[model samples]
Every structure is written in C-alpha cells, then in structure tokens.
Target chain A: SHMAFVTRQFMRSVSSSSTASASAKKIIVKHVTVIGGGLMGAGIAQVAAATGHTVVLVDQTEDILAKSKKGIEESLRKVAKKKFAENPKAGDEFVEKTLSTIATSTDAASVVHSTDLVVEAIVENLKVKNELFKRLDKFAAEHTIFASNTSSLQITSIANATTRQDRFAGLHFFNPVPVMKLVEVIKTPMTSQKTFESLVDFSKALGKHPVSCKDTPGFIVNRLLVPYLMEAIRLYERGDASKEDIDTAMKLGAGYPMGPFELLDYVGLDTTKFIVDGWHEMDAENPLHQPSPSLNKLVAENKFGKKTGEGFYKYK
Target chain B: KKIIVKHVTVIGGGLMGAGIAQVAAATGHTVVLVDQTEDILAKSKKGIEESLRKVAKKKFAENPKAGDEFVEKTLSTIATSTDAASVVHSTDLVVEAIVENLKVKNELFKRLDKFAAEHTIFASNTSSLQITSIANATTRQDRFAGLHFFNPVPVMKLVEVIKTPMTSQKTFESLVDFSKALGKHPVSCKDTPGFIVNRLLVPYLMEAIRLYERGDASKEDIDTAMKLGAGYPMGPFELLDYVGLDTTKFIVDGWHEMDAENPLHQPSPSLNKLVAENKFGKKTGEGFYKYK
Candidate 1:
C-alpha cells in the first residue's frame, strides 16, 4: 500500500460510510465455495467459516487440498488460542467448530454441486482459471455468482468463459486475508448492479472494508502502488542512498513496514518483475511498467525471492 | 530615549527578500530594499503588498482601517534603491538575501562596507555558501554574520544565527537579540551544507527516493505506510514530486559534488532519469503522480 495514497483512499472510505445507519444492508452469504485451496483460498474460507458461513474449499489435488486445510486449521487454532488464552476449553471448542464448516475436496465438480457462491483463488494462469470456471459453470446453482480473486488479470477476460457474465466480479482480498480489512470490489462492464452490491455486503460480513473500482489492472492499490516500489528500486540501482537509509526513510519518513528492496525480496522480485512484465505487455508506453535492468538481472540469476533465500535483499 | 531600529535595508529582493521586507513593514520597520533592477524590485514590492493584505485580513480583521494602516505603514517605510552611492547608509542593519554567487555578493558589500556605520550589523541570509567567506568581505567580520530564515518567512518561526570561524560573540549575540525582537526562534549552528532542517530532511528524502527505485512496496503503499504508519504530513514520493525532481536532484548533486563519501547524500539514478526527462513534479504538473 502506498501510505499516502492509502491514507487518501482510507480517508475516502471512512468519510463515505460516516452515515452508517442510512447505508446499512444485511449480508446473505450463507454459503461460500472457495475454489483453489491455496493459502489465500484457505484464509478466505477460514474467515467465512469463522463468521458462521458454510465454506467449501476446492482444489485440483487431494495432497494440496489437505495441506491447505491443515494450514487453515492450524491458523484457526493459533487465532482461537490467542483470543481465548484465559479460557482454554472455549478456544479448543471454537477451533474445532470453525474447522468443521470447511469441507475440502480434490474434485471441484462435487464442491460446486451444492454451493451458493464460488470465489476462484486459482493460480495466475488465465487459461487454467478459465478451464476451471468453465467446468464449474455447468453445474453451479442458478444464483451461484462467481468471484475471481485474481490480482492482475481483468475480470472481463476471466468472465468470458462463464455464461453468468452479470454475476462475475473481482473480490481482490489482500494477502493474509483474515487480518487485512481491505477488499477491492472490482466491477467489470458485464458485472451487474445487484452482484456488486451483494459482494459489498459479503465483504462487510467478513469484517472488511470494500472499495468499488473498475476492472483496471492493479485496480486502486497496486496500480498506484507498483510504480512507487519501482521508483524505490530505481533509487537503489542509482546508488543514491543505501538500502538501510532507504528503508529507514520509508519507515521513519514515509512509514512503510519495510523499505522497497527488503519488500522486493519479501514479495519476490521475480513476481514483482512478472507483474511489471504483464503491465508492460498490456501498456508498453507506460514507463512505470517497464522493468529495470537490475530486476531483469536478478530474475535471470533465478534469485526469485525468500523461497530462494535472496532477491532485492536477502532473507532468513 | 526610544530604540532606533528604523530604515532597515534588505539586500537582494528575491523570495526571501520580498518575504523579509513584508515582515519588516508589518512590524513597523522603515525598510530599504536594494536590488540590481527595477523589475525585480517591483515584483518583490508587489509581492510584499499582496502578502501583507493576506496578513492584514488575518491579523487585523476586526478593523479594516487598522489593517490598511498596517499595510500602508509597512509599505511607507520600505524605499527601494539601486543607486549604490546616493542612498544614505544610515540604517540599523543591512540584511543580504542575495544570489548564492560569492563574487557578486562580495562586490555588493564592498560598496556598502565603507558607507555602513560602526554600530550597524551585516547579515547574509544564504542557506548554503560559507558565512566566513561572506563575512571576511566586510571590514568588520564581528558585525557580519549569517541570519538564515526559512521559506515563507512570515509563517515559519525558526531562524539560524549562523557563525563563521571569524564571527565575534557580540555579532552572534546581537543577531540572536534581533531574531528575538522579530519574534522568531533562533538556533545557532556552524556553517554546514544544509544546516539542520535540510541536513536531516535531504538524507531522509534521498532514502525514500531509493526505496522507490527498488521494487518493494508500491509507491502508494510506501507513502501510505509512512503517513499512516510513521505519521508524516505527506509521503516521500508526494513530497519529492512536490519539491520538483530537478530541484531535488540539484541539491543532491551539489552535496555529492562537494563530498563524494557521504552515501546518504548520493543522487538516485531514477531521480536523474526523471530530471532528464523533464518530469520535475507538481510545478510541471507531472512527476511520480501525474496531474489531470
């Protein structure tokens, strides 16, 4: 999040909803089927399940689904134990019940058979997501509106595979979804008014602030955000300021959690480069989208990120 | 007997000059504003009038007559002069807020040095450039020192009573008293490149620029992180863009040119690249964030 932009955007959000009662609307998210049981999918499912909604986590493989489910259970347990630290019995009970709402399966076919809504948190591959949605589109309930958690790809492009174009929208949840309150509700041209409103209601039910925007690449946060990060990288490349000073200034001056280089390592410079490459592919003329030489050099060396133990800056 | 602190002469009517003149007039000091040309002098005086009118509205709002009187009194006191010889040097103190050019400033003082009184203190309001170098130009370096004021002089209260190696204690004390007389908080510092505010500020800004160069947080996030997380008034990128890429680059370039070892003062390639492309900032209506 660019701190200033986020502040402006946050201020807008706080101001927009100041008249609370007048804008109050009941959320009807009784059941939610989160497709692609990855970390984000698991977290989304956990939050939904914890909020007393029936959650179905679907993945392509049993092993991956099991790992994701276990991760969610562990997360729920950690949260419950910390929340009910004084009351051990209640914490255990809450964790058991929360995990029970989530019924995971390798088969996406069976997951959508009885689901009310589907939120696709699949890999960044459009073709795989399209094929997965095309399969689920056949059997999903008539009112089973679909939501893509894709960060970069356009909702319109993803929605093209499904007949329920009006129901498809982008519910962009930040990483570690349970804790972060922001959910950028992206509305494509084909997305209906009812669908957009319902998603907003759903986001509120999950205890998140939802800001509506068009299906522009990077939407609000990332669109304005990536360039700032790129600019930081540019500074480092120029050797204007050291990594430590750069990080310090952002933390002390701008108030970022981590400096750009540190964050690049944490975010995986390759993934960042990958995102920049996508923006470049779409809009080449935009200087912000153009990847820097250092970024390319780092990626070529295969120092992807923390997983590789190095990127912009090193990690443990 | 009343204190005789009238007919204040301000050398070099640039932004600081106009601001100082306006402040002097508002405070009832008959000011002598000296500039090389009539056009620059007129701009400075006109700028002072507009600024005082704004101040009058704020300060003397209840009495329109009093406000006009304040503006008129201040304007009445100020007499602009380009004639180096004709204008009598019979003034309390002559403050130089001139160009950073050393030879030009020395020559300006050379003409006034013979004419200035024994009691009159000479002050240079140069943010950069050595106070000692400027003070040595005058016959009495004891009466010559530095009075560095911030931009928008009326609004900002802090002033640095800069001292050179040759600056006398009495000169420093009088300048401090002068600052107090004008209701400004005065801090003393040995002549440094940026002094205190910019010494801390420029490095921080440079670091923020570096963060932007590498892919870490998005510009918005880093800025958001700073404002929300750190509690700054504005994020680094916004400030950098607001300050103009070219100007910031120039400041850093100057520092690096002086001392190459200081990593914090180093200029970012991204900044240089931005300057070269002419994406200065808000002044140009384009920089990190483009203006509609």
Candidate 2:
C-alpha cells in the first residue's frame, strides 16, 4: 500500500482568464473569405457556402479559382446526390444555391472589406502568411475575425501579425474536411473569449463537432496521433510483427478502423514525415519527434503512400 | 488435422484465470481450476458461477430452465484443485496465468514438467515477459508457448497465441485450436515483448501520459480530442484509468528494464507516482481521477 510520490501533475496551460470569458456579444460569421484554392481551402469554402454563409474563395489566378470552384461543384453534387436521393430537383436547387453564394476572386484584399471572417489556408510559410494578414488587416473591417487553417504552424505567431489578435485563432480542419466532422478550435493567449467562442459557433454552423485546445504542437489530434503512428512504424521496423498482422491486430484487437500501416499508407508517408520533421527540428531532444529511418527511406524513394503507386505498401 | 485440446488445467484462481476457466467450461472442455489455497479456489468457483448466471440470463432469456441447465452443465464440467502439479497428468494443456513475474512463473512450469505427460502442451497466459525464457524453464521446451489472453477473458474475444523458437509447430497449432474451441479469435505472434496489441498499445498510452506531462494540453481536452478526432473508444487518460495504472506501470517498467535505450518504453513520472500512491485506476476507486 506504500508508494513514492515525487512527481506532480504538469499543467502549463490549463484555461483562459475567467474575466476574459465575459462576452455576451455573439459573433455570428455570415460572410466568409477563404484564401487558398487547394484541397483544404476549397473544402472550407464549399462547406461555408453550403451552410448558408456567403463565401469568397481567393487564389493567385482566375484559372486556379475556376478549378477550385469546379472541384467544389463536383463535391457538392456528390454530397447532394446522397442527402436528397429521393428528390433530384431539390438536390439541383441546393447545389445551385450553394454555388451562387460562393464567388471566386484572385485578390484577397479586394474582398476582405465585406467579409465577416477571413480563413487563411495558404502555404505554411510564416513570413508570407504575415505579409498577407498585414495586407488584409489594412482592408478588412474591425470585426472580421482572422483564422488560419495551418496544422503545423504556431497560431499565436500567426495572430501576432495582425492588429486584431483578440479576433484571431486557429480553425484547423482535417483532410477531406467535409467528410471529417471534428474541428479543433485553438485559442492563443491573446485570443479573446469572443474570438474562440465565435470560431466554435462557426465550426458548429458548418456541421462540425469542435474540440478546444491551447495552441501547441500538432494541437491535440496530430500531437497524439503522429507520435503513435511513428511508434507503430518503429514496431514494424523492429520486426516484432508483420505489417499485415499489425494491421489486423489493431483492427481486431484495438477496434481501430485502420491499422497504423493502413493509416500511414492512406495519410501519405510524405505528410507524416513533414510533420515529424518539423517537430524534430522544433525539439531535437524528444525521441517522439525523432526521424524514422524506414519512413525517410520510403519518402526518399518518392513513395508518398496511396497518392503514389507505392509507399509502405504498393497501391492499385 | 490440427491438434485438439480436450482437457485444460488453468492455474491461478484470479479474475483472468477464473474467466478462462468459465469460458472453457461453457464451451464443454473439462477444466481444472487451480490455485494456492482451497478458499481461493472456492472463491474462484463462486465468481465463475455468478459470471455464468449473468451470461446464461442473456443467452437463454426466454427459457429460464434452459439457462439454469446451461449454468449447471458448465459448472459440472469444472473441477477445482489447490495443487496444480497433481492435475497435470490428466490435463492436455496447462495455462499458467498466475503472475507476471518470470521467476515465479518459471518455477511453476519447471515443477509441473516432472508430473505432466509428454504431449501435455504447456502455455503461460502472460500478457508481458518473454515466452522463450519461460519456455526454457522446462525440458519439454518444444511443447512450451504463450497463450496470452486479454483482461476479463470471457468477454474479450482476442487470444494472442505466441510461438517461441523452441516451440514446435504442432504445439502452436494445439493452442490455436484450443482458443478457437473457446469461441475466441486467435492471432499468431512471435514470442516478443507485449506481443501485438500490448506492444503498440502500451507505448501509445505512455506517450499520452508524456504529452500531459509536457503541459501542452489538459488531460480532459486531450481525451476529448482523441474521442472526437481519432474516433477512439476511450481517451488515453480514460483508458489508463480503466486499465489500472499499476498494470501499465508493471509492463512499462519490465520493457524499460529490458531495452533501457528505447525511449518508447521509458517511464512516465506521473504514472509511477500514481501507481505508488495505490491509485490503480477504476478498481482502486482513485487513479488519475476519483470515483465514488
């Protein structure tokens, strides 16, 4: 019954100030601006427009925005076909209405004056992000909440670029955003309760189950998930079990939808490597962030998982 | 045809041993439940009876007499003994689920080897510890293997049948067939540390603890994120408490001692401190969280 008690619970970032939480003023995001024509940005744009919010999707060129709009239209048809399987007429009207709400633009600053929320889902380059936010800071209304969809970068650093730090937060969405329901609503130290609550409400409006976390590495999902994936790779690397067996064991034993190998294959080896590589550079001493030899080898061979013909496993 | 197991001697009259005995008996296998004392064996039989009645209630919901007959038949097949060595002559398989300690388990298998028949394939229901080392304790090493079962053995469907280098192909087949007879899905694995589920799972649990230890996110938020984000059945903290911190500590401590260099097996100060305080999760009423 006797045991040693030398350790204490480490709570570096528990909660925000209760006084700062006093905000009866509601922030209902209606007009939205998504800056990027990539998969994530387009998904964000599509979902926002579909949820009855007026959306403007911005990219560098008219051609890129056109492609993004086309992709969104195709994705919407797929969604509508299932939601209203009994009525094609209603589905057609839904798609057209959603599309009508979304306008495409090449210039971000030109559209910010009217939008209530500016979601930056562009490249991970911090300096470019700062430059873009600084430009939008000059044009957008004072109430326009700024949020970045960056998964790896620091949300606090992103918020610092704009004068409206109180209205800034991270609205991270997983890959294939519309399909994945969970969204992480991150709050920086400077982020006001109103901004965090607004993002939470906005996520709910977009039909997502939002979970809150402090601005930390990988936030919550990736922080826990990435390391776990890496450990699975190490388990395979150690040759304790085969990939096929590990996959089967997890699905059967742990009730995981996909095994680590299957998930790593689907998640793209390059993407996991990029996340781990960034974490390694951030904290070299942490073994969890240590680079995996097998993963690096697969990435080096241009086997980027399911996207390519091969990664940890060969694809069809 | 694969090797078939008809008579089984399950050592250790604890929760795991009792569960295994109950399942084996219900499946129509002649089972001898062994423990150190008569009272312990008596308690094991009583617990098995209550568990069987719970199982019978649902299995034969409409026919109360049929449920009673099922419990009675299962109970009729089970016999209890305080001396494990005395029963091995009749047992075709000996499943030792006594403890996780190597020395203690090794001594049991060594003594049983003298009285048990040559074809009486031996197995340790060890969740951790090397099967090869345990198998090496006996002269009939070719018959030794690991028949690892999950906690609450009657409920959990998985059985990790481990094969050491010394174990024969026939011996592995027998254990696999034995598990299948109990209506359990069996998977194959080498006699490695933590085998498959525990190998991947224990490390991940430790990482979750370390993530909390770093002060990055609150435990509640992390749990919520995993449950919502990854679609896990329970958050790591919740699972840690459910699984008992003491159990996890024992596993990690053993692995850490073996591979001292692997950071994955490294100890979490929080886990050690909690276990030290006798807060062994849900069973202890206070682990990471308190329960009334």
Candidate 3:
C-alpha cells in the first residue's frame, strides 16, 4: 500500500522535473483550494474560476460556504457580465461557466488532496492559520503550493509551522479583489525560487499584475500608504489646512485619484487605527507608528469610516 | 474680465526665473527679466534665447523661417534689467522668484513696492516661506499672492495660484487669468506649506526613505514596487534623487521648526546625512543612487 503512494509521488516528481527542464523554472496552477469563504476568499475563488481555474472554496460550515457561493454569483453577474450586456446569452453563460468551475466545501483536509494551490484568506488569527497549514500540508499533494493572502502577518512565521516552508509564501490581494489589479507576491527567506515563480505565474493566470517583494511589514502598499494617511490626518489636526483643501491639493496637485482623507474614510477609520496601534506595539519609538489622538478618538466614538457613515467627514 | 498681466516683471534670472520670463514673453506679455548684475542678466537672456530656439526647433520644424522670426519676436518682447526697483514703475505685475532668504526677499519687495504702480499686483514665486510674510513687506498686501510654476516652466502645464488670507479676490483672479493666458492648468489653494504638490509629496518621499532605513526593502526594490504597484511616474527614491535631498531636507527642517511637536515634519536622518555630505541629487554626481 505504501509502495503505491511512493510510486504515484515518484511519477509526479519525475513529471514535474521533466516539465521544469522544458520551462526552466515555472509551474502552472490550475486546481486552486482557497481556505476561508469570507470576502477576500470568495472574491479570489470567483476570479480564479472566471479565469478558467477549478477552485474549491473551503469554510467552516456549509451555510457559510453557501453564502459565499451566493456572493460570488451576484458579483459575477453585476461586475463581470456588465461588459457583455449587449449579448445577454453570452453574459448568462459567462456566469454559468464561472459558477460551474467553483466548488464550495466545508472540509479543508479533503480539498487539499487534489488542489494545485492553496490561497489562505481566512481570519487574521495566526494560531488558527498555523493550525490549518500544519494539518493541510500532511494531506496536500507534493505539487500543491500553499500561500496566504494575509495583509499584516509575517509569511515566515506562518510558513514555519509546516515542513514545506519553501512551498509557502504570501499572495497579498487588495480589497475588492476582483476590481483591484494589484497582487503582491511575497517571497520569504525560505520560499524557493521555483515556488515564487509558480505563484507569479498563478497571479498572471488570474489576470492580476503581480509585483514581487520580500516578506516585509505590509509588503509594499500598506507600509507606504498607512504613514502617509496618518500624516495627512496629523496635518489636519494641527490646523495647517482644512481637510477639504488637503483633499483638493492631493487630487489636483499630486494627481491622486482620491484625497487621503476621503480614502481613509472609505477604507475605514477603525481599520487604519487598528493598523497603526499594532504597528506601534511592534516598534514604540517609530514616529510613524505613534498613534494619533484624532484617529483614536474617532474610533472610540465608533465613527469607523464611510461604512459607519462618519469618520473625518459625514456621509449621506 | 479682471486685470490680466500685460506687463510682467519677473524678478531674478535663475533657471526658474528665466523660464518664467521666457513663458511670459512667449505668451504675448511684456516681461522685464530682472537680476542683480549685468553679466548675470546677459547669461539669463542667453538662456531665454536657447529655450526659445529649442521651442522653435521642436514646434515649428516645418518652417524654420517663421520660427526664427517667432524666436526674435519673443526675445524682443523680454527686456533685461539689473534693477528690479527702477523697472517696476511701469509694470502691472512683478513676480519674484529670487533667493529663498526671507530677509532678501522682503528687502527686494520693500524697495520695489515704493516704485511699482499702486495698481500693479505683487506676486512671489517662492515654493517655501510664507506668502503672507512676503506680502507684509509691501503696503498692498491685498494685491500680493503666490504664482508658483514648476521647473522648466515652458514645458510643464500646471501652475498653482496661492491666495494668502490678506490677498483680495481681484489679485487672485488676476493671477489665475495670467496663468490661463500662459496656457497652464491653474489649481487654487490657500497659502499653506508646500502648496499642494510638495506638502503631500515630501512626506511620502521621507516615508519611502524610512522604509529603506528599516531594511524592509532595498532602495531599488522599493522604487520598483512604487513604479509597478502604485503606478507612479517614478519611485520615491528615484524622485528623491531627482528632487535634491537637500531641497527635501530644507522643507522638512522648516516644517519641523514650525511644528516640532508633530513627527511627520521631523527630518529624516538619511536625508540630512546625504545633504551634509553634499549629495544634493541628480544635479550632483551622486545622491541616493549615483548617476554618471
């Protein structure tokens, strides 16, 4: 019985080795298992499925899986099929084919058996994340590549729980994953060149612009963006200029699509506040990490952002 | 409908000043290009000639005959003067783009205010220093505003028309109309630190350096990340090298002096160290990255 398993693995390895020699270093990801049927997970699954990959979106319960499937279907029609409105039949079939490619599962261990990639977009809890990957690595096939879409966690710390650390990396997707084209492919110190290339290919397959980065705090966007946002707020707090003028300055002068304050309000004050507080804990002396009273005060009053109808500004 | 700039006295004949003079002259305004010395004014006029020739070289390559005439006409329109005060008697607008020193600028503005016609609107092209402080040097504070133009003024389209609190509506409109007449997209802003572009921009550059200082990413990687991911024209490090580190440090140091309690305005050790070493930027042989 053990010989049968060894023979299958041996054949796959040899086949992979042969494929590697031809391409030199890239691996294709066709069967994707996305852990967590939340917003990010469902969006990722929807995108992969739309791009012709067989995706199994796994969650804790059947009900949550069902809800995620519903959200994906809704997005596929409203978001993707909008371009195909003139050809209604093509639009319906587009949603039909995309949904058909995606399978919802309450079980992660069973889904890891046949998947080529695992994109973890679950809760930010490191313990549960470690627990999931530690168990999944045992059941996952030799070719299956594991990746997390964690926004703020260390990829190295997450990868440490598994023996196949080289196979583990980060696939950071922006919020509203289908809309934003950016996908930061983070390669930790242990992430092999082959694994990194495979992930890069996978991101390209999903039609996302992937920028490679070493696993640093917030990768690229967040680390640079957060301090700038906090500083914008501080400028407002100091009575240097009104928030409206600052917003106007950035949009007209700097060529930003949206003003920093408006973006903060849209991104959620609570979310930004949370990021800074956590960052400050990591390095208390960092001037950038130092908390803002205005931001903290807004969060204290539960004026989270546009989602809560108020932040630095009011929403209709 | 407001008082358009028919005669503009562009004070100082440095790159920024010369370019402003060139654009103003080319745009059909009589610009008296002013500087301290006859030799410097001669060089400044020569620079304006080269700039106009280049414009003619590119824009009217099909007809070199008219281009020469156009360059000659544009040159004839600009008058070079060593004394800004003596020439301001007939000018409708005097735009200061001189030394950044407040004392020198105030002194120049004070002298010019006595000779300049009362109807003439005084505007400074200072990127740093308070426009209000400069405006106070003259009696007509209401007439004074900021008329900031980017470097290589003939090429760049954007111009910022800054309104100090004391500046009247007529003065602001005059500056805006003048900018529009020069074929520029004018953005409005109150007199604030760095106006719009530099205020938002400088801090972000400093933050990028901090990101590198933390060893979070390499300078090249960070530059590449912003270029590829953020869709920026250039990465932060690339921009810092283009915009002198000393220039950035000067702004930050001024801001720090204004607001020491705020951490955002605090100077970066990396930026300060480079400026100390005379690694200004691309103008220098080296900055963040060496350039041949």
Report DockQ per prediction, comma-separated.
0.04, 0.46, 0.32
Indicate the docking level reached by candidate 3. Answer: acceptable
- Which wins on TM-score, candidate 1 or candidate 3? 3
* Number of the top-ranking candidate, with TM-score as the measure: 2
Reference-based TM-score of each model: 0.55, 0.89, 0.78
Clashes of 2: 0
Per-residue alpha-carbon lDDT of candidate 3 for residues A48-164, written as tens digits (9 for 90 to 100): 998999999999899999999999999999865576868878888899999999998888899888899999998887899999999999999988899999876889989998999
Off by over 4 Å in 1: A1-27, B1-292
C-alpha root-mean-square deviation, candidate 2: 6.3
Interface RMSD of each: 9.5, 1.7, 3.1
B274 in model 2: Cα distance from truth in Å?
Answer: 3.2
Worst 10 residues of 1 chain B by lDDT: B224-233
Please give the range of 10 consecutive residues that has the lowest summed lDDT in model 3 chain B.
B224-233
Quality class of the docking in candidate 1, CAPRI style: incorrect
